[PDB]
Amino acid sequence: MEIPVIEPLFTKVTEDIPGAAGPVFDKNGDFYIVAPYVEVNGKPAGEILRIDLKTGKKTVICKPEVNGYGGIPIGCQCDRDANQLFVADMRLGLLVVQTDGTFEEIAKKDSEGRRMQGCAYCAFDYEGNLWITAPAGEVAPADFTISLQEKFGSIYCFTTDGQMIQVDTAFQAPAGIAVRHMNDGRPYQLIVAEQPTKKLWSYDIKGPAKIENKKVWGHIPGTHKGGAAGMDFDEDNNLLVANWGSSHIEVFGPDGGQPKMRIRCPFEKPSALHFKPQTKTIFVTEHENNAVWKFEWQRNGKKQYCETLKFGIF
Template sequence: MAENPEVVVVEPQFSKIVDGLLGAEGPVFDKNGNFFMVAPEVEKDGKFAGQVLKVDLKTKQVAVLCEPVVEGEGGVPAGCQCDKEGNLWIADMRHGIIKVTQDGQMTQVCRQDSEGRPMQGCNDCIFDYQGALWVTAPAGEIAPAPYTRSMEEAFGSVYCMLTSGQVVRVDTGIRFPNGIAILHTDDGRPKKLIVAETPTKLLWSYDIVEPGKVNNKTIWGRLSGDHEGGADGLDFDADNNLLVAHWGSGFIEVFSCEGGQPQKRIKCPFKRTSNLHFKPSSKTVYVTEHDNHALWEFQWENQGKIQKCELLFDN
């Protein structure tokens, strides 16, 4: 697809926070302003050894909070969200969904979905305002099964973990489902699920019927250009524009709430943009990237959409 000359290119000033990490994905804040991210690519002695990191944004000091391990199998943590209690809920490509407390204690949430199928390895996640956790799963069965990814063969899935703890598979047959976001109604009801399919550069939407049930799967948007890679992490701003990390392109694509083609492109000082997340109640966006395994920040024109953990009341 050729570039759309009508797309506005913006070039904000990026500031590097840290680089030289062992991986860079899944940026997230808790409600107290603590910042966390993950390093999925780490290996030790030929085995996976991904890390959950806590970063002091002022001092730029990085501490390893946890190295997920289940029955001797190291993890590949790839995305995370935070609940009101400060627990990190992490999408892990080897262990599915895991929970990590702020003192570094890890729990694997489940090994099977609601219909008894083995869980697949997960990549990214988002809480809706009612407390359900929606999760993409581009990997094959969790450890100890062999590590496989759906980049070529379309066996990727999407899950919803209900507030009861039950994990429901809501769709499957996707090529590497990656970033995930929720569009809510004005009164806070989850309305639309957006899922990035990385190799096709497509953004799919589903109407949310109820927690754990979707219908009307539709192509919602399409990334621009013939660049390497495709859509990775997603995040809405307060005006319901969707910012999409376009891995391999050097840009963050910005879509209106209606989807379609990107309206703006944010030029980054690196090519392999992996994920992004707004600092609460601010226009500051934190971006992870794979070129230098680094964390950056820049100022966007709008504040970020409020996250579940920031709500002062339960919907």
């Protein structure tokens, strides 16, 4: 059996975004991305940008720095309790970013007193817990390292009661992260991409910062440089994964294994993907042209945590 391949129309949203990644929509419908590879004096100076969907014009929302050390923001999720962005930063860890450009560095150390690792991708479950991958070594002012060769990448859970808890470690550059929910809305599986090994790993979610039953969930095709990066679910719990270096987005079924479909990209290096709320439109960031694109998927995306109601009774 061959994996079926579709090639839908990709439309340019914006361009000239150094290391375009972390697409996200806020509670007002505003579109945001990150530009991690922006530099000042040969030093990290990554930016969080807002983009007008009609024109493609860019507004620099936040240029985060802690004690003179610039950030490398990679992955974003919007909160539901307030219109604020949770941003995983490779130099600064987890950040909470306001629309006025002010930001708060969440953790310099974890719950056990260990020094915080630089983060890349984050994902909310419906209970409010933020699951985060950390492929980098220690946060600034430590020297920047990434676990591309040796296994020191970690997984974190920022719980609802504000605890930064390391839930697993010994990953070789952990990348994209997503939560599989059951039909009733209960968090069921935590899917974690491991980039160079071309594998997706899964956990069973038992509760806040509680993961068990670690196993191989899916396989990423290709022997190219790179692998799985940004990823998210559609409404049927199909996982769509940006496969950096393959010119493809992989489509997995709810139970994983081998991809059931491949989406051909007009570029080599998709970095991340995010649905526009209540639509079939996926916004894809990529590193070949350092640009943002959009295409229509077969169905709506999975309801995002920022769309849900904190005081809703259903």
